[PDB]
Amino acid sequence: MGRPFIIVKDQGNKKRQHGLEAKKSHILAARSVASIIKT
Amino acid sequence: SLQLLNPKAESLRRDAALKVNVTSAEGLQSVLETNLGPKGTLKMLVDGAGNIKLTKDGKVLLTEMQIQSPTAVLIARAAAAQDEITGDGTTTVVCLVGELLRQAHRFIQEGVHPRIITDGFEIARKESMKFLDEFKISKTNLSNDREFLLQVARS
Amino acid sequence: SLQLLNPKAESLRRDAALKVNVTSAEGLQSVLETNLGPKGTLKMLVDGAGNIKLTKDGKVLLTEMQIQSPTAVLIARAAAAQDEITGDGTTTVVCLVGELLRQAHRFIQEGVHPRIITDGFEIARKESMKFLDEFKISKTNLSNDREFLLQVARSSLLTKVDADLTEVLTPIVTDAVLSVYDAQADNLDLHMVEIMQMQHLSPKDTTFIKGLVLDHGGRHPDMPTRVKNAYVLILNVSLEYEKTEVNSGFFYSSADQRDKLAASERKFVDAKLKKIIDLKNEVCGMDPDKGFVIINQKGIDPMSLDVFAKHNILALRRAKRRNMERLQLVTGGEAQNSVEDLSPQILGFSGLVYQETIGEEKFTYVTENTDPKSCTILIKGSTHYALAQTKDAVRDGLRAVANVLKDKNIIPGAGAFYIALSRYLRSANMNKLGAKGKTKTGIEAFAEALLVIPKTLVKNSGFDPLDVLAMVEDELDDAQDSDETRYVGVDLNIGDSCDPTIEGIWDSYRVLRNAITGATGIASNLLLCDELLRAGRS
Amino acid sequence: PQNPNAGLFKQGYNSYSNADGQIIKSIAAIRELHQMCLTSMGPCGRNKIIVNHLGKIIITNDAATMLRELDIVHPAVKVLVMATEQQKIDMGDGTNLVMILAGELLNVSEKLISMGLSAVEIIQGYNMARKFTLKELDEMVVGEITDKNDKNELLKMIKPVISSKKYGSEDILSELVSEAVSHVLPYFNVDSIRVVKIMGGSLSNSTVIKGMVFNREPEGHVKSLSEDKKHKVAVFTCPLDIANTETKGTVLLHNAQEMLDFSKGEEKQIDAMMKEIADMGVECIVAGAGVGELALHYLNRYGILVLKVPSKFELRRLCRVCGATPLPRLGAPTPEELGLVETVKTMEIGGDRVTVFKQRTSTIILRGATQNNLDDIERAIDDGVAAVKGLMKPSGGKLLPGAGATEIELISRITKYGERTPGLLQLAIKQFAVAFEVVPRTLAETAGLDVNEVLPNLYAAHNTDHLYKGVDIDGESDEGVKDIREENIYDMLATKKFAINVATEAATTVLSIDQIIMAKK
Amino acid sequence: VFMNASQERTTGRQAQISNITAAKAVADVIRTCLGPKAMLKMLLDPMGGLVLTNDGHAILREIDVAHPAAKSMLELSRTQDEEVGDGTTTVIILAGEILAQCAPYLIEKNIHPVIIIQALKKALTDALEVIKQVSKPVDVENDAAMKKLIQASIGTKYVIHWSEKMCELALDAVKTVREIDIKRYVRVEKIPGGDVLDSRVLKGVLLNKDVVHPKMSRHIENPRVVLLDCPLEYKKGESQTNIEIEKEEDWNRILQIEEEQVQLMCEQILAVRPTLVITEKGVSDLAQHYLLKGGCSVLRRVKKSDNNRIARVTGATIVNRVEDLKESDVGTNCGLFKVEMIGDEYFSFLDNGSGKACTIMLRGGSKDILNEIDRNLQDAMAVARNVMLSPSLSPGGGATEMAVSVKLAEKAKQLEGIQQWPYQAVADAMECIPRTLIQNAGGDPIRLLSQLRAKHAQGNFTTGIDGDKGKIVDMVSYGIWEPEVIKQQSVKTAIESACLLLRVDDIVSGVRK
Amino acid sequence: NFGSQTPTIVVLKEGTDASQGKGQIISNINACVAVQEALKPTLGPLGSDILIVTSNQKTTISNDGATILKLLDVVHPAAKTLVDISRAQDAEVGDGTTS
Ligand SMILES: Nc1ncnc2c1ncn2[C@@H]1O[C@H](COP(=O)(O)OP(=O)(O)O)[C@@H](O)[C@H]1O
Ligand SMILES: Nc1ncnc2c1ncn2[C@@H]1O[C@H](COP(=O)(O)OP(=O)(O)O)[C@@H](O)[C@H]1O
Ligand SMILES: Nc1ncnc2c1ncn2[C@@H]1O[C@H](COP(=O)(O)OP(=O)(O)O)[C@@H](O)[C@H]1O
Ligand SMILES: Nc1ncnc2c1ncn2[C@@H]1O[C@H](COP(=O)(O)OP(=O)(O)O)[C@@H](O)[C@H]1O
Ligand code: BEF
Ligand code: BEF
Ligand code: BEF
Ligand code: BEF
Ligand code: BEF
Ligand SMILES: [Mg+2]
Ligand SMILES: [Mg+2]
């Protein structure tokens, strides 16, 4: 019941940030941007 | 002796040259005798493009195929000269040089100078030609025989 | 259908399998007809090392070369099974299979089932074998005809070497076989066959020695070169320092105990030496004419060499493990192993033993023996390529004369036997059975196929092969209508008909007996195949 | 070890001799694509999704289309493929039966080749059986319906042909087909009916228009005399712009008095072109070629609709619906060569500003969701569209009892000719019959019924009310068959004629060969 | 990964086809090797030898097969040879056309495999009872009636030419190993050349060894024989003995113990008044002196398996311990010992009472074609040993097979239902042997199968095909009868085969371990 | 015959993918499920938005189903149906695309 499949195009080159652990990586990104300028 | 004039030259000498020629002509009659008469069999050819040619004609197999043997390409040119001047008999020529080379080789291998059999070929050819003039049946074609000419298409 | 079972499998199917087999045999015979008879031509061969072998011998070309064609390697196996069982005729088998497959092929391409010709091969082979038993001439060999046997060496050597080298080797071969054979009908070749080779002089220098010339000598400088009346001693038990098979290592605690042991390890050998000298004194002491010589299978210690050189003995070490037996049939005494059960009734005698030295190598002779049943063909020869070439000539004659003795018969040569078959088998095809018709063609081929030997002899001769054939064919019918049938073969010198009985050129029975049954067996098996397959693990 | 060669005359080939590549290796390579469309035959058959050489998706029930979209190697396989392409161009339907017969004609030929028969024996025996099959078919025909160009009879005829390609709605589709054909019939051109597919809605939302649909941009303004009716039309091959010559047009100006007069004279030069067309009472000009910006400006004021973009396709299929005649010479707008249209408005479908030419040549607007499936049901429509043209031309339209009834009566009737012939040839004629077991067998196998319990129940009921009995779908018919005379299920004679004939040629021609020779790519 | 990747799965009808395809195309490489008109498929092995024969199992044996269904098919001609000897060709042709006539015609009409297996299992129980009722029991010791057996079973491969001699060599080989036999007490030493008419079964054993000492006799009239399972040199301490010398004298006393140990053996060996002594292990150069004085010709290093062969002929028993050499262990009634010389190489003969082991001397025309005769004699000696165990004989030449056809063609019609289709296709399968026997002959199969099938129904069991003619022949009057167990096992495994491969619906590739 | 080896006539050209039976039907459903499952969040008042960066660095943020399914490059031929199924909804209606 296992077939190696191709749903989206160039599936091997597509990374997916998911759920909360994505939001952390998004907010902290903005955070770093902020530390550059806040001074 | 020859090998001194060109380091990279291929050559079949003496009795080997004769053997190559005969094996080849015997061989080319071996791949075309499947076509002789109505008892013959139909062959399917497919070229590198994927095109299906489908013919029992002798001159067809010879045009349609890539001949490599030099002694063989020479025999295929006799078949061309046949089809271009006669139309029919392009298979008769091939296996007539086959069995002709084959039957003559049976004597050269025994120890007979080829030139000896070559004259015997010509002196029989001249005879075979005088016999033909005397073996044919004269159909009055100036009278245009309706059904006799129907039995030549049918043949 | 086969290509599914294995993706990478070579196969030659149907009528191509026949062809591939026939073209190859027809071919092997095209590389091996340059050898047939004395009219043939010498070929030089150089292997990858650079070693020049130089022989016209059929089996030689085949063993000296790398064979790739499978149908070919099978034909070279009938040639080997010929040389190992007969000695001669290793070429006859190859081109007999050649023209046997060639002649059988002409009918199959005409549209004849192989099996039809196969039976026509056997039914002819059965007939050819009954014919042979009747064609041979019964030479009364139990009467040992001195010069008739001289004309079997001269017939078999000429087809391998010179015009003037053959007149030299002829007696040396014949006199060898004759110096082996016994009234109880035995001939254990390997004994009186000792082919010795020497690098010096010339191949036309070969000498017959009615004794045995060895490959070693006295390893001590003070030993005798010439022993006038040699009592030969044949020993095998090692005269050397040997440790015990159970671990030997010893212990000693005195500066003296060393030396009083240093001889205690040599004592065993010296006590074995004593019993020898005690015979060398009991037999020689009384006779200053009578000498004492040893030929030892195992070693002779340097400590023990100074011993034999002292008591004027001629010692000889590590002789061939077969020469024990050869010497017994040379001198007379049985080969003793132990020294402790040794009597003077066991000593063999040779009226002369001398040591010739060449550079640094030494050759111990055994001459003037009272009665020998074993001899030696001392092949002398300058180079190294000849020393094998003139050996491979002597072999093909020493086994050729011994076939005249083993078989109480012989067959007239020049290929008279084959011509006679080709005439007989062409006539009695209606007679043999009133045969299955189909069977008839198989004979008709096999029959006219045998004519190879004659033709391929005239081919080599240079004369017109089809012409000198018809010549023998013509002068035979002259005797066939004159009632008294006299043998007729091909004269290779003048390109004419001739009588091999008169010309003195003979050809062994067993050779022609295992030539036909071998060729038919391999040719009538090569036809019957329909596939050539290659499949197996990587 | 190592093996020698056989013969080197060529550059590097492969030869498939002893009829091997024909008697076995060919039959089985055909069986691979025989089992393919075996499960695509009939209403219970499954569609196959084929992604081509360029990544474009294609889904079809059709054998010929499904085979045309594949890349094929095996030469003897290619033979039956051109044969399915034969009956595609020459009948439209039966493409699946070409395969299913020829494939089995060879599949069942395997038991003969191994029995001990020759190649020339089976060839002649299949020829003697085909020539009988076509002869014993012509005397089973029912309802040679030829009620002129009847609209109610077309619906009964098309329903089964549509049904076995897209079983979803045989009713809702064939009504669209019949209605479009009804607007053309007064030889009934396949080309006289056009198909325009645009995404949106369902398969039911589909309509039939007594004219045409143009997905091109309209220009000046939309004709609202459409409500009032009776609009006049003119067509042009020429571009609606100042007529240039084919040879390089240079404009040599000498005096300054030329500049003003050229440019302002150009204004009038084409205003006068347009006026000679407006004064003829024309309300719609369809341009195949170009239109100048000055020329459309005057036409814009003269209150006339413009429809640029057509290639030669449209200019001919629009010509037949309005009844105009297109002239290349811009100087002759004749009243005897004008057209007449009932409505030319901007009806917006799926969001696209589309021009309509309704109320001869007609156009079906097939609507749905997937632009994929809509492509297939266009081929289903074209099957019946071409099935209608096949009724008109030949003198007899004619009808056969389908669903298997035609095929099973053949199994019985061909064997009857089998036992009459004695000789060795008898078996080839008898096996030719058993091969016809495939048409009902695949209909059953697609429905998921006991192959071993339907076929004996179908033969038994066929041994004159027996003539109609052929296999059916569902749980009550899981018992067996249905009286095909009552469900309005028939296929035509000219459909089964081309099929059984081309399939016998296709299976013969692969049996004619015994040595295939092929070259490297 | 989910599974392992790199795994090609073949499932359903797809997998089924692959098995029947291969199994049937296996029969194809041997179809032209059936019966009398059969050929010789010449084979190149991997490391450079050559094999060219007919013997079905010897052709397949030298072919490498990858597709498991054919790896299952080939290793199935092995079971056949390892049971009967002949019929290794047949088995695979049936195995094929049981899967061919049966499967595709009916697996591609939706019939489930497990019903088919039960249907084909009954068709065997039926087929065996048919063969055993169409066969006729034979006298196993009517020496001349048994030669007609062997005459028929060799009348296939290149050996026919000399059947009369071969049958005498086969029958006389099995006669002197018979309480029942094992044909591996029969060394078949092949000696190149001569001709077949020179081959002679020796009631005894032949060796390639020469007498170890020249003086020892090469001819003994009636030799008393001792056989030895032990070396004839002094043995060592198996306990890792090592000697530590202190005194001067010590050396000679020990170095003679080994000289004496042998004399203690020789005194014990010679104490049984022998004239011949043969050992499995090598013989010392001091042992020969005490056995020369004993008057015994000694043979060294002779094969372990050759000893059990000699001890059975000569009647002496082999003993490891020299100490306990008894009066029984000596060769009473071996009539001769000689060392005749067959051109270059020395061979030791042992000729002339109650034999139970035997050496077949073979002579031919090559070392290569000799093997192809041994392959025929092994197939000859087999058909003779079968019959002495199973005294009954089937009427062969396609006749036994056709018998199974119309008996099963009647039983199928009388069975009906769904189980009938597979059952009526083993009956279809049997006729494949006649079919290929007409073919290899060269007659029209359909024309002759017709005049065979119907001419069997009311024309006796023994109605089959004559090979060379290609016509119907009553096999009673002709003389082709194959042993009953061949026809038994042939049909047994060939069905057991088709019913192993049908259970396959799935092929998972890349499994490991 | 010319060749000592004569391989096997091919049905289709090397590199041709073929899938049959139950595998096929159930694989196509699962493939579709995948496209759906990832589009399932954007539904309803508390729906999640998706941030897609296309192969050409084009960064887009959306809740519009047709826009998400279009910017996703669906290759699977059976799951391309769900893109055409959403596209038709934007063409005739505008809303529903996700649903
Ligand atoms: N019905 C027939 N019976 C016997 N021989 C025939 C028949 N028809 C044609 N032939 C012979 O077969 C030959 C025709 O060969 P064909 O295959 O046409 O090749 P080609 O004529 O090019 O050599 C002629 O020589 C003719 O004599
Ligand atoms: N003087 C001669 N005249 C004619 N034939 C000869 C003569 N000497 C030898 N022969 C023949 O030559 C053959 C020997 O061939 P040879 O070259 O030794 O090869 P092979 O290994 O086959 O014996 C014999 O058949 C013999 O009859
Ligand atoms: N409603 C139906 N019920 C049962 N069988 C049908 C029905 N409609 C058509 N058929 C059968 O389907 C066959 C046509 O199959 P189809 O898939 O259209 O391929 P083709 O038309 O190319 O042969 C006809 O033989 C017909 O008898
Ligand atoms: N002369 C003959 N004519 C017809 N059939 C024969 C003849 N000899 C043997 N047979 C049949 O063919 C079989 C022998 O063929 P063979 O090639 O040896 O196959 P296998 O190796 O399986 O025994 C026998 O079992 C017998 O039934
Ligand atoms: F094949 Be031919 F030129 F009639
Ligand atoms: F070349 Be041979 F064996 F005399
Ligand atoms: F396969 Be078809 F032309 F409905
Ligand atoms: F060819 Be067999 F196994 F006798
Ligand atoms: F996500 Be949608 F187009 F309301
Ligand atoms: Mg259809
Ligand atoms: Mg919404």
Short mmCIF file of N, CA and C and ligand atoms in Angstrom, two decimals, chain C residues 32 35-37 56-60 79 82-83 87-92 156 159-160 396 511, ligand 6:
data_model
loop_
_atom_site.label_atom_id
_atom_site.label_comp_id
_atom_site.label_asym_id
_atom_site.label_seq_id
_atom_site.Cartn_x
_atom_site.Cartn_y
_atom_site.Cartn_z
N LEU C 32 45.65 -27.03 -40.28
CA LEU C 32 46.37 -28.24 -39.92
C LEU C 32 46.51 -29.25 -41.05
N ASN C 35 50.77 -29.90 -42.51
CA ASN C 35 51.59 -30.80 -41.73
C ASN C 35 51.63 -32.23 -42.26
N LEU C 36 50.75 -32.54 -43.21
CA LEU C 36 50.50 -33.92 -43.62
C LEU C 36 51.62 -34.53 -44.46
N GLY C 37 52.28 -35.54 -43.89
CA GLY C 37 53.37 -36.25 -44.56
C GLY C 37 54.70 -35.50 -44.55
N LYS C 56 56.38 -29.78 -36.74
CA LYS C 56 55.36 -30.12 -37.72
C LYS C 56 54.28 -31.04 -37.13
N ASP C 57 54.55 -31.58 -35.93
CA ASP C 57 53.66 -32.54 -35.28
C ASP C 57 52.27 -31.94 -35.05
N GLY C 58 51.24 -32.72 -35.37
CA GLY C 58 49.85 -32.28 -35.25
C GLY C 58 49.46 -31.94 -33.83
N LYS C 59 49.60 -32.91 -32.93
CA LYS C 59 49.29 -32.72 -31.51
C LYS C 59 50.07 -31.56 -30.90
N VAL C 60 51.24 -31.28 -31.47
CA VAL C 60 52.07 -30.16 -31.02
C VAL C 60 51.36 -28.82 -31.22
N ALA C 79 42.27 -35.55 -31.09
CA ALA C 79 43.67 -35.55 -31.48
C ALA C 79 44.57 -35.94 -30.30
N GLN C 82 44.26 -39.43 -29.44
CA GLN C 82 44.99 -40.20 -30.44
C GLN C 82 46.46 -40.33 -30.04
N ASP C 83 47.10 -39.20 -29.73
CA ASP C 83 48.53 -39.18 -29.38
C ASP C 83 48.83 -39.95 -28.09
N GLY C 87 50.16 -42.58 -30.46
CA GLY C 87 51.45 -41.94 -30.69
C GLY C 87 51.46 -41.13 -31.98
N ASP C 88 50.87 -41.68 -33.03
CA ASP C 88 50.82 -41.00 -34.32
C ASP C 88 49.39 -40.76 -34.82
N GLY C 89 49.25 -39.89 -35.81
CA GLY C 89 47.99 -39.68 -36.51
C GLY C 89 47.10 -38.58 -35.98
N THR C 90 47.71 -37.60 -35.30
CA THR C 90 46.98 -36.51 -34.66
C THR C 90 46.50 -35.46 -35.67
N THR C 91 47.01 -35.54 -36.89
CA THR C 91 46.61 -34.65 -37.97
C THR C 91 45.51 -35.30 -38.79
N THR C 92 45.65 -36.61 -39.03
CA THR C 92 44.65 -37.42 -39.75
C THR C 92 43.25 -37.27 -39.16
N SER C 156 58.10 -43.17 -40.22
CA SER C 156 57.48 -42.29 -39.23
C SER C 156 58.35 -41.09 -38.84
N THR C 159 58.51 -37.97 -41.61
CA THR C 159 57.36 -37.07 -41.59
C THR C 159 57.42 -36.06 -40.44
N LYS C 160 58.60 -35.90 -39.85
CA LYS C 160 58.80 -34.97 -38.73
C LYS C 160 60.11 -34.19 -38.83
N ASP C 396 57.25 -39.91 -31.69
CA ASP C 396 56.35 -40.27 -32.80
C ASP C 396 56.91 -41.37 -33.72
N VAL C 511 46.90 -47.05 -35.34
CA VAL C 511 46.76 -45.66 -35.77
C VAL C 511 45.50 -45.47 -36.60
F1 BEF G 6 51.50 -34.93 -36.96
BE1 BEF G 6 51.45 -36.62 -36.47
F2 BEF G 6 50.60 -37.06 -34.99
F3 BEF G 6 52.52 -37.80 -37.24
#
